[PDB]
């Protein structure tokens, strides 16, 4: 995250880490006891998630093994140049213990309006494009940018299942944030897909899966 701060410790009870040993792969969002979202292109044959972290170097905090990880059927494995339903459901191996440090995001049914004030978070760099991960979670302001400015920032590739949001500040999502939470007014808009290089640059901002466009695949998958 950059142009941001360490977030309040547990202030995003949602917030998932998926990781390969003591690497982060990806961020994630706690949708139910069993379930976890992120960006399809998380994918790893092996890796574990962890919730209820705060300081990657720390009873919230659990790691859960994974049973099955499910893409969207419509994204493409092949061809990493389109990000198009680049969204993934977790399947949790055992249950999460809920609490007030750790429990569910509710899912967006109405898509994000313009303007609209977010909160981004996760435990990716700092900078760009030098890398500096923070050991701590890191929360950061943005807001809905309009689809026409989303376009013009990147012509051709926006699609109707996508939002961008940024700050005019340079405040973005970056390296190791990917699949992590856009969250407005308390409900999951986004799940961060891709973005420019280097991050943090107003004209440029980060592409965030969006959540509306999704729900009813969701929802069916884990019913
Ligand atoms: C993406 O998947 C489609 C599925 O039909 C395939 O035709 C296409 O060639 C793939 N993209 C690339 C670059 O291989």
């Given at each position: 995250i950059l142009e941001g701060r360490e977030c309040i410790p547990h202030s995003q009870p949602w917030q998932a880490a998926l990781f390969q040993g003591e690497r982060l792969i990806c961020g994630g969002v706690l949708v139910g006891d069993r379930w976890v979202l992120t960006?399809?292109?998380?994918?790893?044959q092996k890796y574990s998630v962890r919730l209820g972290?705060?300081?990657?170097?720390?009873?919230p905090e659990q790691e859960i093994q994974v049973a099955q990880s499910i893409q969207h059927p419509c994204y493409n494995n092949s061809n990493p140049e389109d990000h198009s339903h680049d969204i993934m459901l977790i399947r949790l191996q055992n249950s999460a213990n809920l609490g007030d440090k750790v429990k569910p995001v509710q899912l967006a049914n109405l898509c994000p309006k313009v303007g609209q004030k977010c909160i981004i978070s996760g435990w990716g760099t700092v900078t760009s494009p030098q890398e500096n991960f923070p050991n701590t979670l890191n929360c950061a302001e943005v807001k809905i940018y309009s689809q026409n400015k989303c376009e013009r920032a990147y012509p051709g590739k926006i699609t109707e299942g996508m939002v961008c949001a940024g700050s005019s500040n340079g405040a973005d999502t970056c390296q190791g944030?990917?699949?992590?939470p856009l969250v407005c007014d308390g409900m999951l808009q986004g799940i961060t897909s891709w973005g420019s290089?280097?991050?943090?640059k107003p004209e440029k901002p980060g592409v965030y899966t969006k959540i509306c466009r999704y729900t009813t695949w969701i929802k069916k998958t884990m019913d």
């Open positions: 960006a399809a292109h998380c994918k790893k972290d705060h300081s990657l170097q720390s009873q944030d990917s699949g992590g290089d280097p991050c943090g």
